[PDB]
Design a protein around this ligand. Structure first.
Ligand SMILES: C[C@@H](O)Cn1c(=O)n(C[C@H]2CO2)c(=O)n(C[C@@H]2CO2)c1=O
Ligand SMILES: C[C@@H](O)Cn1c(=O)n(C[C@H]2CO2)c(=O)n(C[C@@H]2CO2)c1=O
Lengths: 305, 305
């Protein structure tokens, strides 16, 4: 029993993390097969971060400029190119620890595990979610750039995030493994602000189901509601509009508890209109929205890898 | 920036997790060098969980009764003994992946990382704390027994917890790696209840310091206080008594923020007497007490391994 924020076992990704140095700057890189993946802003100098022309800054760079340190050993660089906002450094040695991997662009509301690193060495691991505004609330200090997010299913690692920057608001923005930024963010030190951070409604319901399973049933009520009428309360509280697909995704949880999705939507509406009144649900005094329906099933059924 | 609940990289421990089968029961075991460590209640049958005599149940067990599966391979068992509440199965093959390890009995209030497993295979990782009542609030399903807790410093893994059971109250109890239970708990299906779960005061202050660093300063006030007078508010709210050693441990955080420990104790007292009034600190609506002073420094300075 018990429900916790759980990251995946990070072993398979540790062995893909390297140190990448270009000139005076060091950041983390991911090393699968004979390619090292890192953010392209490794090549920006002290005064270039405001408005760099990355194509031009590349002309003045050759293979031997990028120094890649694996653990304590050196990797020989034999090719490089710029794909969107990441660099792809072809090294001469395939990584012996390359797990079965895939590059996936995840959707807002989905969650992943982040292995925070500095100088190509791991520091820790935490579970994050792609906010509706395409930012993540994580823990990154200077030099964590290149840290990656991923999901582990069976024996296959699906890489979905590479960290690029912190915004003036203290939140984080990054790209997928093809170099495309999540959201309208660019790798420049310009004025860019995240939009309204709405709540992942389908994820709050999944967490309420997880609570029922774990013995917390005080928030269950004698009301029900309809989708259209529930969405009208969600909009007032900046909650993501709940669709029928979301309802279908909650089926397995709805069947395991004998609680209709709409009856659970009615209890949520009460929480939004009346607050928690100093009560706690799964040890928390606010509504948690960083658990997907699959996240709950995974932890409440004990899926392994 | 950003402050998160962070587990250590779990790679070095994954390669020590095995499956242990004894008769009809399967649970997880830890495999360092040529010894496999598992809970001794692997040998209890369906009707034995109420009042087992583990010495007697051992007489009827020999080496070939314990089947140890490493990944998908079989380990040959050549010796076994019972130390407190864990078994020590001597196998004939040293583990090639044995990290630099140590067995440590941690103190109430300290934190560690837990790698949850089922059938000797990892499922995930989360950060826990040893409550003052010697229980932990974690996520364990049937078969997670044998999952271990640990800290990683430099390249050395300090194992401190092996999970044994869930209590009728939904919390968790276990042992150190010498088999001694944390708290007054036994590996029996008897009536055992955890005591008062008081709050780790030194850990709440460390988390308040982490908040100041990350931009949340609304809880800082114009008051101060004394230790004796603050403890009198702590006792009313079932908070662990704050000693001078605790104050000394908070020095480094106190110096990095230019905030005396006692001035921070005064802000906490206000939170306890007046509540948070619907405000959030580091994204949470209650006072978090599962971050040690070293946990905060680690994450706010970027320590790696
Ligand atoms: C990659 C992470 O480690 C965070 N980070 C970062 O996003 N930028 C992008 C731009 C906003 O400054 C950056 O330039 N640096 C270097 C130091 C802070 O100026 C930096 O550390
Ligand atoms: C080891 C973990 O997986 C949890 N767990 C457990 O603590 N006990 C000890 C005693 C209270 O029942 C136990 O017997 N089992 C087997 C199934 C539940 O009866 C069990 O799964």
């Amino acid at each position: 029993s018990g429900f916790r924020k759980m990251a995946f076992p990070s072993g398979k990704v540790e062995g893909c993390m390297v140190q990448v140095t270009c000139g005076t700057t060091t950041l983390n890189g991911l090393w699968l097969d004979d390619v090292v993946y890192c953010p392209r802003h490794v090549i920006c100098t002290s005064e270039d971060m405001l408005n760099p022309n990355y194509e031009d800054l590349l002309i003045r760079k050759s293979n031997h400029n990028f120094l890649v340190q694996a653990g304590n050993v050196q990797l020989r660089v034999i090719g490089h190119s710029m794909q969107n906002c990441v660099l792809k450094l072809k090294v001469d040695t395939a990584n012996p620890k390359t797990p079965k991997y895939k590059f996936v662009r995840i959707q807002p509301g989905q969650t992943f595990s982040v292995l925070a690193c500095y100088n190509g060495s791991p520091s820790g691991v935490y579970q994050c979610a792609m906010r509706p505004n395409f930012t993540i609330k994580g823990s990154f200090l200077n030099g964590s750039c290149g840290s990656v997010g991923f999901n582990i299913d069976y024996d296959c690692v699906s890489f979905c995030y590479m960290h690029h920057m912190e915004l003036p608001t203290g939140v984080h923005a990054g790209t997928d493994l093809e170099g495309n930024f999540y959201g309208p963010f660019v790798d420049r030190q310009t004025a860019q602000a995240a939009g309204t951070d709405t709540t992942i409604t389908v994820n709050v319901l999944a967490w309420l189901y997880a609570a029922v399973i774990n013995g917390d049933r005080w928030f269950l009520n004698r009301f029900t509601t309809t989708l259209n009428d529930f969405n009208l309360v969600a909009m007032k509280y900046n909650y993501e509009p709940l669709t029928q697909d979301h309802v279908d995704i909650l089926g397995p949880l709805s069947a395991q508890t004998g609680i209709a999705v709409l009856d659970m939507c009615a209890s949520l509406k009460e929480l939004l209109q009346n607050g928690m009144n100093g009560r706690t649900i799964l040890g928390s005094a606010l509504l948690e929205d960083e658990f997907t329906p699959f996240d709950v099933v995974r932890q409440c059924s004990g899926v392994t890898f």
